[PDB]
Amino acid sequence: LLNIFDIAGSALAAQSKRLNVAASNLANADSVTGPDGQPYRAKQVVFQVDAAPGQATGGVKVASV
């Protein structure tokens, strides 16, 4: 995967996962219960700057919803 392509594709994936979490939140507002029976806790995504070795910048990773 070419470097700048990697950066922008990581951005696409991260934005998509953020939107999917937001859609789940917006749909599950007013949801009495989960499967086992527990509140539906609203979900958020965590963005971190990717490429831990080198340049301290480049791409976004969305690990740990």
Next chain:
Amino acid sequence: GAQSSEQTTLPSGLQIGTGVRPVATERLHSQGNLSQTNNSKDVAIKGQGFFQ
């Protein structure tokens, strides 16, 4: 589904249902009051029964 009784859980299934169709139009057959008409040929009924 199956209620395990391990957790307090909702008995969730799903049935929707429809409609309120009228099923009957009952005739409440009680003795009405009497009104005097002074007419000789007129007559009312105490208790049940119908003129044929």
